[PDB]
Design a binder for this molecule. Sequence first.
Ligand SMILES: CCC1=C(C)/C(=C/C2=NC(=C\c3[nH]c(/C=C4\NC(=O)[C@H](C)[C@H]4CC)c(C)c3CCC(=O)O)/C(CCC(=O)O)=C2C)NC1=O
Ligand SMILES: CCC1=C(C)/C(=C/C2=NC(=C\c3[nH]c(/C=C4\NC(=O)[C@H](C)[C@H]4CC)c(C)c3CCC(=O)O)/C(CCC(=O)O)=C2C)NC1=O
Lengths: 54, 162, 160
Amino acid sequence: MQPIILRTLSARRPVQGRPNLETYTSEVERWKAIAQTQYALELAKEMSRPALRT
Amino acid sequence: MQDAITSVINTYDVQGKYFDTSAFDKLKAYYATGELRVRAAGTISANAATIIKEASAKLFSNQPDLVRPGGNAYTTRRYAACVRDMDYFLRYATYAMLAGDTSILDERVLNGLKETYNSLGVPISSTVQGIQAMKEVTGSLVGSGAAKEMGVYFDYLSSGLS
Amino acid sequence: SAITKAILNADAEARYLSPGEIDVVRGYLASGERRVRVARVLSDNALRIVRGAGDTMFQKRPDLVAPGGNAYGEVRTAKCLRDLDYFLRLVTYGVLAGDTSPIDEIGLIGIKETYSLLEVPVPGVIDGIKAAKQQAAALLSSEDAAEASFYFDYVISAMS
Ligand SMILES: CCC1=C(C)/C(=C/C2=NC(=C\c3[nH]c(/C=C4\NC(=O)[C@H](C)[C@H]4CC)c(C)c3CCC(=O)O)/C(CCC(=O)O)=C2C)NC1=O
Ligand SMILES: CCC1=C(C)/C(=C/C2=NC(=C\c3[nH]c(/C=C4\NC(=O)[C@H](C)[C@H]4CC)c(C)c3CCC(=O)O)/C(CCC(=O)O)=C2C)NC1=O
């Protein structure tokens, strides 16, 4: 058995840990706020109706 | 009381207008969810006793002093009143889930309930915890989408009593 | 029946059948073919449904047929299986009528105090009824099984 066969090649990924996601989390919170506004607008439209006219 | 359809009718009637595209969209949404609501209501009515048993077991395990002497649910009469209250909460939450509207909880449940509980010495936070226990059990039994639907009315009851 | 409920509601208000009530009656008359199919399947298979449900009930709760059990002996096991057969017949009636009025009138009103005075374990009855529900669902299609299970679950919840 004399062919050179390579068994354990190192991977592409680096050894470091996961970079933090604070800026991504902030932008996601911005999207959440935008999405909450579009439902809050409808419910607010509901809030401004007259009192006893059912 | 109102359902989603009656809520739309009330809006458009007080405005004096015929149904527009947005109204038809709202009505389509309620019709689309109708099958899920009917399925969940049937499941709950099939399982109401078990839901009460599990929810009261969890409430009285978390707060064992309720059903011991000195606790508001210590006597056969006050334990019975307790589980009957939980049963009514479950039934009216099921009603409000079918209607797609929380109005029936305002008309038939919440108004004057905080005062009655304070006047009788019923612990209100413990009652809210029992309602939450029913929420957990019911969500387990109905499935994910129906759980997200029933949670709205359970939380409505919880916030009304809180 | 569904027609009976619509008519009783119309008569309570001294009026004729409303469009919603007419629609309810029309929906029931449309579902009649499916109802007759489910009832026929449950009726021709009553023996096997009751036999299987009784077998699995007595296996789940052997103390019922053990000495000192509520159904101990041939006569009492016979009455137990006869009760299960009664409830299957009531489920067929409910499937046909489209409501639970036959079930309530014939078998449910008064069953709780009856089994209380007889000291019949209601959980054992519910085990037999659930067993009958699974036996029936085995012989039915998915939609037919759901339709039958509505009235099976009504019976269980009235017992519990
Ligand atoms: C003074 C009026 C009053 C009574 C009587 C009362 C009884 C009572 N028994 C309970 C549990 C229990 N009670 C029993 C007793 C039964 N098990 C066997 O079958 C016997 C036939 C029988 C006793 C002779 C058992 C086994 C449990 C435990 C059930 C469980 O773990 O959930 C509970 C649930 C919470 C707890 O553990 O305290 C109550 C409230 N509470 C009251 O406020
Ligand atoms: C058509 C409507 C109808 C129903 C529903 C009905 C139930 C019924 N079952 C009875 C007896 C009984 N029922 C059972 C059944 C029990 N055995 C096991 O424990 C199980 C938990 C359970 C069945 C799954 C037994 C064993 C008896 C005899 C009890 C006795 O005589 O002491 C009795 C008392 C009269 C009699 O002996 O026949 C009634 C009224 N009767 C009716 O006319």
